[PDB]
């Protein structure tokens, strides 16, 4: 929603899972890429530096259905099938005490609205 600004004052979770008044500082995109692992598993969330068959970040994304080698949360690497890229508007956010989340549209407030 294209209702939040750079500079805005509003209202997110904290890291301690508290919803504080913070300021967000820049509007970015982050690019996540869906793959099928061969067991047929299906993860809707790597980031392009998660493939380490090729090098996402300097050549962009595998063609649809391409054989890949996907780095997993656990370290370890997992055969799987190239679906998707969805580029998501996220919200760099700053905190009274100088911490830093990048959230989803759906986790700030304005200061008008009812929480949550």
Request: hydrophobic share 30%; net charge negative.
């Amino acid at each position: 929603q294209g209702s939040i600004t750079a500079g805005q004052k509003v209202i997110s979770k904290h890291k301690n899972g508290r919803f504080y008044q913070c300021e967000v500082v820049r509007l970015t995109t982050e690019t996540f890429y869906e793959v099928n692992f061969d067991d047929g598993s299906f993860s809707d969330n790597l980031y392009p530096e998660d493939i380490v068959s090729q090098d996402c970040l300097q050549f962009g994304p595998p063609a649809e259905g391409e054989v890949v080698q996907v780095r997993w949360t656990d370290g370890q690497v997992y055969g799987a099938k190239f679906v998707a890229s969805h580029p998501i508007q996220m919200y760099q956010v700053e905190f009274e005490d100088g911490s830093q989340l990048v959230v989803k549209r759906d986790d700030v407030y304005t200061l008008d609205e009812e929480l949550p």
